[PDB]
Amino acid sequence: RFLKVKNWETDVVLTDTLHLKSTLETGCTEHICMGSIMLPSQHTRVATKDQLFPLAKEFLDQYYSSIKRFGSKAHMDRLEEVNKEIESTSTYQLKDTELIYGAKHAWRNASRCVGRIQWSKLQVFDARDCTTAHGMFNYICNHVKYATNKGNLRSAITIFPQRTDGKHDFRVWNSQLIRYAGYKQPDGSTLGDPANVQFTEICIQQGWKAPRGRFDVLPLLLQANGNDPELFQIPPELVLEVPIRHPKFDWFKDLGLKWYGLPAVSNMLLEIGGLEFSACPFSGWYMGTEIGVRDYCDNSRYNILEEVAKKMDLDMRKTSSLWKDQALVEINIAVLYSFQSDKVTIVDHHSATESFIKHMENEYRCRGGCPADWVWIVPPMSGSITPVFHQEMLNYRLTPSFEYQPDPWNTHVWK
Amino acid sequence: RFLKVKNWETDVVLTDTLHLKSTLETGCTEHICMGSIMLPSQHTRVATKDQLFPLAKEFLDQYYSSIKRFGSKAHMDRLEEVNKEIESTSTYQLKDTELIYGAKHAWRNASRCVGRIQWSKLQVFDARDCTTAHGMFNYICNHVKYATNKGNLRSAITIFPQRTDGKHDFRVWNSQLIRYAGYKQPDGSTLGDPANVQFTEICIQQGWKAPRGRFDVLPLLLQANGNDPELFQIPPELVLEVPIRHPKFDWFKDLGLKWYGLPAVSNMLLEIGGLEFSACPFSGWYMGTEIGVRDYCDNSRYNILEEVAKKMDLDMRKTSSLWKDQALVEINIAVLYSFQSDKVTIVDHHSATESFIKHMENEYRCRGGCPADWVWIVPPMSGSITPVFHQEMLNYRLTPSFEYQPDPWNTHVWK
Ligand code: HEM
Numbered sequence: 012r013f014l015k016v017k018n019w020e021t022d023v024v025l026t027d028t029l030h031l032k033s034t035l036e037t038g039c040t041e042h043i044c045m046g047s048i049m050l051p052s053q054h055t056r057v058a059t060k061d062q063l064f065p066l067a068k069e070f071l072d073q074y075y076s077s078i079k080r081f082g083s084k085a086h087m088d089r090l091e092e093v094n095k096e097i098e099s100t101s102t103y104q105l106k107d108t109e110l111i112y113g114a115k116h117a118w119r120n121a122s123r124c125v126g127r128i129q130w131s132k133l134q135v136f137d138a139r140d141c142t143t144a145h146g147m148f149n150y151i152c153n154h155v156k157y158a159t160n161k162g163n164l165r166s167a168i169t170i171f172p173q174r175t176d177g178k179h180d181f182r183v184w185n186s187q188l189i190r191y192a193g194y195k196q197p198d199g200s201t202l203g204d205p206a207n208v209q210f211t212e213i214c215i216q217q218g219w220k221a222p223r224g225r226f227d228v229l230p231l232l233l234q235a236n237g238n239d240p241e242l243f244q245i246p247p248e249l250v251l252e253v254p255i256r257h258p259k260f261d262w263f264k265d266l267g268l269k270w271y272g273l274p275a276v277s278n279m280l281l282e283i284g285g286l287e288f289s290a291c292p293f294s295g296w297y298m299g300t301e302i303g304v305r306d307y308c309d310n311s312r313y314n315i316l317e318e319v320a321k322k323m324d325l326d327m328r329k330t331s332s333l334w335k336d337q338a339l340v341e342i343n344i345a346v347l348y349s350f351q352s353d354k355v356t357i358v359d360h361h362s363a364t365e366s367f368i369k370h371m372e373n374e375y376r377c378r379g380g381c382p383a384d385w386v387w388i389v390p391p392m393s394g395s396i397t398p399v400f401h402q403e404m405l406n407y408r409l410t411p412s413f414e415y416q417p418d419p420w421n422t423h424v425w426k
Numbered sequence: 427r428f429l430k431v432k433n434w435e436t437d438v439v440l441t442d443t444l445h446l447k448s449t450l451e452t453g454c455t456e457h458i459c460m461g462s463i464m465l466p467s468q469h470t471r472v473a474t475k476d477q478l479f480p481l482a483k484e485f486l487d488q489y490y491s492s493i494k495r496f497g498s499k500a501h502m503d504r505l506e507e508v509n510k511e512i513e514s515t516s517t518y519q520l521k522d523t524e525l526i527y528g529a530k531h532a533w534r535n536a537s538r539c540v541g542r543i544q545w546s547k548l549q550v551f552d553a554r555d556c557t558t559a560h561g562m563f564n565y566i567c568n569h570v571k572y573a574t575n576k577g578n579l580r581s582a583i584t585i586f587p588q589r590t591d592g593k594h595d596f597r598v599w600n601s602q603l604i605r606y607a608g609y610k611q612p613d614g615s616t617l618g619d620p621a622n623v624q625f626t627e628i629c630i631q632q633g634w635k636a637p638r639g640r641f642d643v644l645p646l647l648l649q650a651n652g653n654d655p656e657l658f659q660i661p662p663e664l665v666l667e668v669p670i671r672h673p674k675f676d677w678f679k680d681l682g683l684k685w686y687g688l689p690a691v692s693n694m695l696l697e698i699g700g701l702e703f704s705a706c707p708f709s710g711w712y713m714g715t716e717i718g719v720r721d722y723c724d725n726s727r728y729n730i731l732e733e734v735a736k737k738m739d740l741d742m743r744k745t746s747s748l749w750k751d752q753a754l755v756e757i758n759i760a761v762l763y764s765f766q767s768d769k770v771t772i773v774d775h776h777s778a779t780e781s782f783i784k785h786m787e788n789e790y791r792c793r794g795g796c797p798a799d800w801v802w803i804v805p806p807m808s809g810s811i812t813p814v815f816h817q818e819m820l821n822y823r824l825t826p827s828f829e830y831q832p833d834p835w836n837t838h839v840w841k
């Protein structure tokens with residue numbers, strides 16, 4: 012069917028036909044909806060040569076039918092040229108223009124990303140000539156320097172060689188290029204980021220010397236062509252950081268918090284015409300709530316609601332005092348204000364969710380729809396005073412796409 | 427399959443097998459997830475006699491297999507007794523114990539209700555001997571008096587005669603028993619509740635004399651046995667109200683807000699063993715955010731973020747000042763504090779979402795699962811500092827159930 016989605020704050024109706032092009036599967040059925048399962052066994056991704064040419068043809072048909080040359084001579088010859096090469100090698104190689112298109116549309120198709128209004132402004136760095144972890148480190152550094160741009164952040168992706176057999180894989184073992192370390196204490200508590208305690212100790216295992224503090228930047232663990240991964244330290248001058256202060260409470264500086272400017276995810280898989288790129292770090296800029304709500308106030312992360320409430324003079328005895336809510340707002344005003352006063356790109360959840368509604372309108376117009384995961388798009392605070400709360404959204408999977416993949420340390424043949 | 431749901435704040439895993447009993451359909455498919463569509467064409471509900479006995483048998487099998495007498499003599503005789511009566515009349519009549527069971531389990535099965543830990547403490551008022559709108563008014567008044575209990579609120583449902591042919595329907599035209607009126611102005615703005623502007627003018631149409639103010643309690647519009655609906659005014663002494671003040675800001679009293687104590691939905695349909703009860707008003711007590719976030723701060727409702735921010739001395743020029751967020755927290759501390767100081771039952775979104783996680787555990791233990799709609803369960807503010815944000819939830823439809831139904835004024839043969 013050609014389904015309708017409604018906004019209940021403005022009564023706007025849009026018609027989705029793009030879902031007819033949808034290919035992958037959701038995890039839902041007619042009798043169960045799994046839209047709140049985090050890592051369904053569909054959002055995660057070994058493929059053979061028979062299955063490859065339909066996926067190449069499907070992709071190539073979209074590419075040429077977008078540069079305004081569907082079915083022309085250049086299209087049919089590339090169709091045959093790729094057919095021939097999949098016959099010869101049981102794989103094939105994207106042109107540079109095809110790689111840039113595919114990467115931009117994987118982002119365009121990321122239903123859980125609220126930032127996609129920017130999808131066509133993506134800088135693609137082709138690292139498919141990389142062969143060693145040192146080369147990887149070099150490519151990653153250049154990506155971090157470019158994307159940061161002195162705090163005037165620029166979105167970018169670096170794409171390492173595609174998977175071939177499976178035992179020869181390029182992988183970044185870090186989940187993000189820039190992350191703070193987590194250390195478990197002699198008693199039991201946690202210094203730094205509890206999320207990374209396991210990875211912090213893998214770096215310790217392979218040889219890292221930990222400054223065992225709070226906001227210690229982890230080294231990169233880089234695996235090239237299936238070889239064992241090697242440690243490298245991002246030059247500190249390349250890691251831009253923002254000390255968090257408040258435009259009111261002067262005790263807020265004493266909290267001694269700070270965060271890094273560059274959100275750069277490095278553990279996911281990029282799929283383009285049936286080709287799988289197992290190392291493809293991509294970066295943008297932060298929405299404020301990622302740091303102030305999730306990073307700082309998740310119970311299993313930094314978990315600072317306690318201390319901010321104390322210093323705010325809050326009624327912490329009762330739950331219905333909303334002391335947690337009240338400290339959460341101040342923390343997020345602070346993250347935003349610090350980044351802005353330092354000229355580091357950041358977006359608040361009101362501006363970002365408005366832009367995504369604007370983006371949704373454009374997509375239903377010039378595309379017939381916009382796949383969207385409400386569970387992930389609505390921000391983790393103040394949900395219903397943002398316009399995405401009230402927007403019905405259809406979730407479906409289109410390719411090119413970003414997918415989850417198993418962690419390398421559970422699947423790698425070592426020693 | 428026998429699926430697993432995970433909590434990512436505590437790493438707890440539960441196994442859902444109850445979804446195998448699921449019967450209805452979600453709206454989702456393998457290729458699209460519609461978990462954010464508000465009123466899917468499945469959550470809404472004319473049935474014949476052939477389809478009726480499977481639904482009666484299915485229901486009767488659950489009922490007897492719960493009072494610890496599955497398949498016994500009393501079960502098989504009621505099975506045959508209902509079979510005989512569906513042969514004779516092409517419908518049938520629930521026993522009183524069956525009605526109480528069915529109603530309690532419709533609530534138990536309401537995947538969008540965060541309050542269900544209380545599902546077994548429901549007071550069921552049998553109004554199936556009702557025949558006139560005056561009788562309806564009398565039954566409703568008694569329900570409002572009982573459920574309110576001097577501010578010590580008690581959950582309750584009143585069940586009017588079941589649908590028979592379709593043209594003879596009991597209906598409450600109000601969407602809730604107690605609602606404030608909405609009036610459009612001579613210029614264009616809105617006094618009172620903008621949500622009810624249409625219904626407020628239907629009461630005006632049928633003869634209501636509007637005190638054209640803010641918090642005017644609407645009359646009841648009651649339709650009995652398919653006849654045209656008639657207006658009745660709930661005695662003011664039965665409508666308990668809470669003036670909203672703040673435990674800090676003394677200008678907050680000057681805002682002149684108040685709300686009613688009793689949330690009582692009256693426009694939905696109760697399905698029990700294939701029988702449809704088109705009038706079945708049910709009431710509980712409020713979660714604070716329903717009033718303070720949605721009722722007061724929705725753009726298309728009372729929309730008070732402006733005035734509270736002004737009186738709070740807020741930087742309203744910029745969006746990233748989070749002045750909206752900051753005023754939203756104060757408004758909700760105020761709703762909670764007013765209700766509590768007046769001894770009117772209310773629950774904060776932290777206590778309620780903790781109880782639902784507790785409830786989910788009980789259901790997976792003694793039931794094999796708990797159908798749950800994440801999109802509706804996560805509260806509309808401070809989502810991720812409540813434990814339901816981090817809880818994966820399977821949504822599926824079980825019967826007995828509450829369903830949506832068309833508004834009566836679009837389907838009724840008038841004059
Ligand atoms: C340019 C500014 C950007 C902003 C403000 C932004 C914002 C966000 C946010 C808030 C999330 C939710 C993440 C979470 O809560 O953990 C997200 C998810 C995501 N973003 Fe964007 N993002 C941006 C750029 C990008 C870029 C450049 C890419 C890829 C080239 C990308 C791809 C994704 C993907 C694949 C996900 C979710 C993965 C999944 O769970 O399936 N984003 N983004």
Ligand code: HEM
Nearest residue numbers: 533536538539540541544581583708709710711712713828
């Ligand atoms: C006892 C205290 C109760 C609390 C605290 C509570 C809380 C809630 C809340 C917050 C919602 C979301 C509504 C919205 O956001 O508009 C909800 C929905 C709902 N509640 Fe409960 N509720 C309670 C009692 C009941 C009772 C007694 C019934 C029926 C007998 C019931 C049935 C439902 C249904 C059917 C829905 C959602 C309908 C739908 O959208 O499909 N609730 N409840």
Ligand SMILES: CCN(CC)CCc1cc(F)c(F)c(CCc2cc(C)cc(N)n2)c1
Nearest residue numbers: 126274275276279293294295296297298301
């Ligand atoms: C493991 C699953 N979760 C943790 C439970 C994290 C997954 C995840 C997957 C993404 F693609 C993703 F972008 C993020 C947020 C980081 C980010 C990146 C960019 C480019 C911009 C931005 N603004 N933010 C988190």
Ligand SMILES: CCN(CC)CCc1cc(F)c(F)c(CCc2cc(C)cc(N)n2)c1
Nearest residue numbers: 541689690691694708709710711712713716
């Ligand atoms: C028309 C769809 N929406 C508006 C878009 C409203 C539907 C709806 C359907 C319910 F069953 C429902 F309970 C509510 C909240 C009112 C309520 C009732 C009770 C018993 C307890 C409580 N705490 N709250 C709203």
Ligand SMILES: C[C@H](O)[C@H](O)[C@H]1CNc2nc(N)[nH]c(=O)c2N1
Nearest residue numbers: 047048049386387815816817818
């Ligand atoms: C259980 C639930 O799916 C999980 O907590 C999700 C909910 N929505 C989210 N949304 C975003 N943007 N990021 C997240 O990490 C999550 N977590």
Ligand SMILES: C[C@H](O)[C@H](O)[C@H]1CNc2nc(N)[nH]c(=O)c2N1
Nearest residue numbers: 400401402403462463464801802
């Ligand atoms: C579009 C979206 O489905 C709609 O705004 C829903 C979202 N979740 C909700 N959740 C609750 N509890 N109440 C609501 O009215 C809504 N509205």
Ligand SMILES: [Zn+2]
Nearest residue numbers: 039044045459
């Ligand atoms: Zn679904």
